[PDB]
Structures are given as structure tokens and as C-alpha cells.
Amino acid sequence: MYGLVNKAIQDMISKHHGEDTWEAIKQKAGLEDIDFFVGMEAYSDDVTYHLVGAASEVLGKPAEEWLIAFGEYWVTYTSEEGYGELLASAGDSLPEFMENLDNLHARVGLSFPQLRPPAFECQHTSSKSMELHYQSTRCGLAPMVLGLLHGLGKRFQTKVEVTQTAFRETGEDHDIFSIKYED
Numbered sequence: 117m118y119g120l121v122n123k124a125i126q127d128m129i130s131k132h133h134g135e136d137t138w139e140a141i142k143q144k145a146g147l148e149d150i151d152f153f154v155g156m157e158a159y160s161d162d163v164t165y166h167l168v169g170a171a172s173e174v175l176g177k178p179a180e181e182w183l184i185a186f187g188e189y190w191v192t193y194t195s196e197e198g199y200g201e202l203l204a205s206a207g208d209s210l211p212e213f214m215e216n217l218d219n220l221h222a223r224v225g226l227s228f229p230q231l232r233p234p235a236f237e238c239q240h241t242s243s244k245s246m247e248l249h250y251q252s253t254r255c256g257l258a259p260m261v262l263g264l265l266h267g268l269g270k271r272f273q274t275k276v277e278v279t280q281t282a283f284r285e286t287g288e289d290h291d292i293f294s295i296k297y298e299d
């Protein structure tokens with residue numbers, strides 16, 4: 117993934133647990149030689165998955181739990197590190213934002229030429245619920261999606277209830293979530 121993602125990971129760990137913890141995680145992930153991540157540079161996805169795994173071990177959290185926190189963090193990170201207006205432009209409610217997400221990544225993809233963005237499709241079941249289809253070229257990121265949804269809930273001051281109903285890993289087509297939301 118682009119370096120931006122790996123910077124966000126470093127920033128979250130550093131902010132929440134301090135530099136020493138970050139250094140131990142970076143070492144454990146096999147990344148000691150990397151002085152810094154370059155935000156607009158493409159990295160092997162392996163870099164990210166190794167950080168997740170190292171973080172899980174060092175912190176003693178399940179990786180899924182950690183990815184949820186990271187997904188929630190991304191919503192704040194992007195808004196603060198150069199993508200605040202882009203985020204704002206994607207809307208002011210959760211369902212509108214999710215409808216706009218493919219278009220938001222299309223916009224990101226203008227600047228990040230090698231982007232492999234997720235694809236999100238909403239099927240609205242009422243004015244307060246939807247089925248969310250999450251399609252990706254990557255494995256294992258559903259828990260990050262769960263966190264992202266909670267970050268968006270906070271962003272829009274909306275209570276979000278999210279349950280995963282289909283699993284990419286289990287050999288189903290793609291991840292699906294049922295979501296209820298209320299002001």
C-alpha cells in the first residue's frame with residue numbers, strides 16, 4: 117500500500133503507546149532499516165501486514181482488534197494530514213458518505229496513480245439501515261472497515277451498529293455488513 121497508510125500506522129502507535137513501543141514493533145516487523153515511510157510512494161502490502169502482526173504481538177492484542185482501532189484512527193488521520201477538504205466533499209451523513217466512497221477513492225486515485233482502492237456498494241434497506249458490500253483485491257481488512265465505520269459514526273455524530281454477514285476469507289464472494297444508524 118502507499119506509504120501514507122504505513123505513516124498512519126506509525127503515527128497511531130507512537131501517539132498511543134510512544135516511540136519505544138513503535139521502534140519495537142518496527143523492528144519486530146522486519147523494518148528496522150527503513151528510516152521513514154514516504155507518503156506518496158508505493159510499498160509492498162507485506163510492509164503493512166507485517167506491522168499489523170508485529171503490533172498484535174508487541175501490544176498483546178488480537179490483530180483484528182488492532183485493525184479496528186486503526187480503521188477508526190484513519191478517519192481522523194486523513195482529515196488532519198492533508199485530506200480534510202476531500203473528506204468533507206464526500207458528504208455530511210454516513211449513508212451519503214458511503215455512497216460517495218468509490219468516487220472519493222477515484223479522486224484519491226488521480227493523485228495516487230497505482231492505487232488499488234476498495235470498492236463499496238450500498239443497498240439501502242431503509243432510511244436508517246443498509247447492507248454494505250465491501251470488495252477488495254486484499255485479504256484480511258474487514259476489521260479495518262468495521263473501525264472505519266465507527267470513525268465515520270463519530271465524524272457525523274451518528275450511532276452506528278455494524279454486523280458482518282458475509283466473509284471474503286470463508287470463501288464467500290466478498291465481505292458484507294448490515295448497518296443501522298441513527299442521529
Ligand code: HEM
Pocket residue numbers: 117118120121191194195199200202203217221224228230231232233234251252253254257260261264265
Ligand atoms: C480522504 C480520505 C481517504 C484517503 C486519502 C484514502 C486513501 C487511501 C489509500 C492511499 C489507500 C491505500 C490503497 C493502496 O495503496 O493501493 C486506501 C485504502 C483503503 N481505504 Fe481509503 N482513503 C480515505 C478514506 C477512506 C475511508 C473514509 C474509508 C472508509 C471505509 C476508506 C476505506 C479504505 C479501505 C477499507 C482500504 C484498504 C484497501 C483495500 O481494501 O484493498 N478509505 N485509502
